[PDB]
Design a protein around this ligand. Sequence first.
Ligand SMILES: CCCCCCCC/C=C\CCCCCCCC(=O)OC[C@H](COP(=O)(O)OCCN)OC(=O)CCCCCCC/C=C/CCCCCCCC
Lengths: 316, 320, 197, 197, 197, 191
Amino acid sequence: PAYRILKPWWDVFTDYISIVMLMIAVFGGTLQVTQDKMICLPCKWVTKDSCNDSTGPTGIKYDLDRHQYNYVDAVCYENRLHWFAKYFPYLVLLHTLIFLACSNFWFKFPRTSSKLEHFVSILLKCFDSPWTTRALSEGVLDKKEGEQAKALFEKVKKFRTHVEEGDIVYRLYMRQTIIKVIKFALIICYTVYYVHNIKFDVDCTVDIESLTGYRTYRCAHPLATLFKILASFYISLVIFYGLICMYTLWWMLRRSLKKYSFESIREESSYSDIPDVKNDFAFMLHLIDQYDPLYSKRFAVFLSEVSENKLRQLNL
Amino acid sequence: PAYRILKPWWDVFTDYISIVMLMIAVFGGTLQVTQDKMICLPCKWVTKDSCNDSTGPTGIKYDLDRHQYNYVDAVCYENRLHWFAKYFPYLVLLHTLIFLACSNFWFKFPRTSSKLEHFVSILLKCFDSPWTTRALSEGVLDKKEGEQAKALFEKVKKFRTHVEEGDIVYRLYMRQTIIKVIKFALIICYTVYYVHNIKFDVDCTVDIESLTGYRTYRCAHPLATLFKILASFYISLVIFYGLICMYTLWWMLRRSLKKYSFESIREESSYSDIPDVKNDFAFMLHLIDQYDPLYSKRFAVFLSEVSENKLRQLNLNNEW
Amino acid sequence: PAYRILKPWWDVFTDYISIVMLMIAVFGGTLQVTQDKMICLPCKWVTKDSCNDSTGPTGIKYDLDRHQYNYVDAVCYENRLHWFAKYFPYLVLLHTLIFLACSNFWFKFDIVYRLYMRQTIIKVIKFALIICYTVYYVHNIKFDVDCTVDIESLTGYRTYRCAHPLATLFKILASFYISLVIFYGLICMYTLWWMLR
Amino acid sequence: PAYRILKPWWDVFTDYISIVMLMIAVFGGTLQVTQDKMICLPCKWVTKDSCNDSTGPTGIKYDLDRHQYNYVDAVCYENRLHWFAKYFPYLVLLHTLIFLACSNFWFKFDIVYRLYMRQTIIKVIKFALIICYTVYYVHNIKFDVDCTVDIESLTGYRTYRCAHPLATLFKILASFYISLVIFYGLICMYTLWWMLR
Amino acid sequence: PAYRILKPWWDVFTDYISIVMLMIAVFGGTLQVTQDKMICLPCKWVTKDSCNDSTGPTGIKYDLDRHQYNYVDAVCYENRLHWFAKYFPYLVLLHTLIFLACSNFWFKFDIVYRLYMRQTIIKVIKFALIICYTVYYVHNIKFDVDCTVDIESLTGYRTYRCAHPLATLFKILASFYISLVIFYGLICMYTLWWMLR
Amino acid sequence: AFRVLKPWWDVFTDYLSVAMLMIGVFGCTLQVMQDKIICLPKRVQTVEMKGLKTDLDLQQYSFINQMCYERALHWYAKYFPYLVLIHTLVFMLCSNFWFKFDILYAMYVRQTVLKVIKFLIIIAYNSALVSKVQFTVDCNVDIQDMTGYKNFSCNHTMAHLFSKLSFCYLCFVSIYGLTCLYTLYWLFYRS
Ligand SMILES: CCCCCCCC/C=C\CCCCCCCC(=O)OC[C@H](COP(=O)(O)OCCN)OC(=O)CCCCCCC/C=C/CCCCCCCC
């Protein structure tokens, strides 16, 4: 849909980070689905609901069947294992889905999507028109090419009139980035202060004494360390994502995006009456600047009435 | 395709919510197919078919084989596990499929499909027409572009006559929205009332003493709280869907969508002859205004007859 | 392609119902391939090849290995489980494949009118056969199946009481499958009604 | 592409038959790679390498561990199961692939007409060999399998009576396969006569 | 796209080697999720954390439940196995992703010449570091692991002689990786000379 | 389209290499299965027969399984699909070597000669080492200290399948080498 020119480097980096967070979430989720088991063994010596831990050695017989063990595993995996250690992959699924929705909201919101595709289409049309090249290099003009040149001038004028009035795209991108930064802050706060609860050895005390005979059990969690690693790795990526997001907000407070200055482009060129555009038109011009200012240079000559005068006398 | 112009923001929102709902359904379905089980342990001491819940401690011996234990898990998984905890993902898949079929119901229904493709085709090709630029600019008219503009004028008049008679698309969209909102209400009701039955601990009494020796067993359903939170998550999605649909229904009852007015466009433009379209014409024009007013502004000229007279004058000067 | 003008509303809904029935078919086939089995416990008390069904409770010692249990499950799946309860997803696969072959035969082949009329008659009578033949046998899918295979010389018992885990879910498939077939026939009814009017 | 004018109805029908044969081969290979096994219990009371087949009932203790049982199952799966019952999916896969290569021979290879003539002779003679070898060996698959591998030095018994759970499936698969091949061959046979006349 | 003809032969060679080493990493990850365990058998003669080893043969009774065995194996795997043997596939997966991202970073962003400078330098330096760290730790992918955790309060033993099953194959997989990277490194040095030409 | 300069031998080799890759994927799927070897001790301690009590746990049995997989089963018998996959990757890499490269004649005969020698080496090695894929295996690992038995007899579950796959693989490489030798004969028969 040729929207790639409208997503700057920060948007592409955040989308890649969200894709790899989706990968992390999928891997952690399938591991938690398939092989997230807890191996619980009772402790014989109880010291006030605490485990005492005290020629040829002989194995310790608990007289427990293979289902009694599976029941105590389920009970101490549910009741006593901390909820983050169980539902971290689902948390990162929800968070990366919300991040992707925030990123592509203004792409999929028709009120701003229509304006965006309008702006993209006319930029692409002005990219290939040759009056742009004649004006920037500043004559022969074929009837057809002069016709679409004047038509494109008229679309530029009407579309500047249509877009310059409102600031819905600018305010929506404001809302998008502030929501992303506040949710990144919440994600880091809760994840940082909850991550340490992933532990390989867990001592559960669930009182299934009527069903197994033991009160306190010591359980291994073979997928804890891996989760820990993934958690750490996931946290690191959010750091990267978080940093990138702040850049965008910093950029969006670096200067007022609701106004644009054509001083450099019209100063280096002959056409000195190119007007300084505002609002949504200025904002998507800023994004195209962050992609390539050559697009802004190529488009800037259709905004002047002096170039209209030159085109009229050349066409005459 | 180019049907995205007919889908406002609420339709896109519901489509994405339905995609996520289908993902939930598939995840729960493979969970129930592969890992869903029960770990059922007999109660050694019982009191009237109820678990009494009664020198280092030692284990309790049940003298049950692995095959007897499998039988106990199977029987207490069918007979005493709540059916919601078992067939929640299949219910979610059914609800998602019905929602998706309702969303694309007017798309594939031929009587509305023909109107929709005709409207989309002539709207897009009217947008592509340079006569809109030449007219809202206000002769500048080639023989060929004047000919295709006359053909498009004829096509627009023909389609207006063809589609003004029936308002079937508006009624179909009304029916889809009302069906979606009532299905949201039903889903929220039964899911809220039944989500409390997904619990980890289940006391089963299946009366297989002749085969195992124990009357009552205590079972742990491992995928219970998960099947709770997913369901809770699912409920949240439905709420969003419903709210979205609610707004859509409100949007289709605040003003009459079968009476369109070109007052703003025909006031800001020089043409004051553009009439007010009705019925399905008005409904699809309102749906397009939910996309942008620009498409309606560039098609209002082709809907006008004074612009047709001006074009006819231009072609008359072109030929003569 | 451009043949959508030759596919009316009934054709579109029948095609969508056919795809949905194909999903049900492949789901049932995957379940049969992966998780279809039985759990069979011997009956301690017997009375002429029938389970007699006759302080703290204790477990019954069947005195059998795990592999003799596996042999009992295999033999009571081969002998005393009904063939339809074992082959229902495959029969539904065959019905859906032949149904797609009948519905889309004229696309891949007054010749066209003859094929269309033959396909309509075939699909109506085939809906009737499918609904009758599936409603008739749907009671053979039971949770509990008592098996009696005479493997005493290899196991030590004559009677067992198997349980089929994926049975009732198949029921939840089968009725729903039948329901889809019902809807198909309903559409067919309207088509025939339209073919009368 | 636009080769449907160069592909007549018999080539398309044989291609569809080959597709069905391919998915039958895939299903058989999947079943054999995941769920294929045998379940062997020794014959406790034997009379000259033959199973004699003879207060409540107690399970027979063979005193074989689950691993000894696995050893017996594998050893009897090789040395006594008929080779067709084990290699049917691979045989049908090879036959389907060679049929595909033969049917799609001119599409990447009056010399074209003579090439099709030789291709039809090769395909029909392979059909003849296929139908002969398949028909002769369909009835060489049985559920209950005798086994006399003489492994008394490792488990303590000589003769075993195993169960082959998906064996019947293969027969049924083979059964359907026969029909496909016959159809394919019959269709191809017509083509030969269609070019002979 | 528009970058097909710019790449020389060595770039295509690097791309092919990257794809091979990509699916090597992926297949290793599948093996790690599937069959990554290790089986510990407790030592019957333990004298201060040391396995002494000082008619028909008979087995040894350890009197451990299968679940105590599971606890022993899990603890000896997450406490007495080197991070390299446990996380070989996730680390090589990270190396694949970083290598591919650095190979294609200039697409996503003489600034282009300086970018491709930095990417080639990063590629060659990471080749060097990967070779160093891999050959420095390749010895720890070995079968026999004498684990000693002292969970005798739960098992009654203190040392176990485990043997990692998917290790030697992992070893040869690792071997394959380094050999591939070696050719990659060779090609990389060529690129270095070109971009130092 | 180079199909004009692609005679029958090149297309035949392409389809054969696709078949090689399919065979290698199937063999890798066979090696994916956890149950690989099954080991029981030897000389373990109308006539009614009784089962011999090996006095072994499940984990002891698994330990002997992996040990006899280590030290008794042949390396080719354990990574035959692995070699097959690597060698078909080599086949598809060097099959288009003349296309992806009197220099034209030179690199074409170079491609044909390299393909021929790879075929001949594969034939020699496969014919030499194919006999090592046996079902009944005798294993003499020294795990008497942990299990109690010093000699074992094992069965490799899919050894027959690997032998059949190797027979099909040898037939495929045989057709490959026959058509490539015909290519070499056509190339060097005339200038
Ligand atoms: C948060 C949700 C996000 C998405 C997650 C979707 C959930 C997917 C649901 C299940 C997926 C696979 C279904 C498997 C069912 C069959 C189970 C089965 O046969 O038994 C489990 C079986 C045996 O396990 P245990 O006996 O514990 O192992 C021995 C202990 N040492 O476990 C397995 O290893 C399963 C087989 C592995 C394949 C499943 C996928 C695992 C993830 C693969 C990682 C690498 C994939 C790379 C992707 C390639 C993409 C190009």
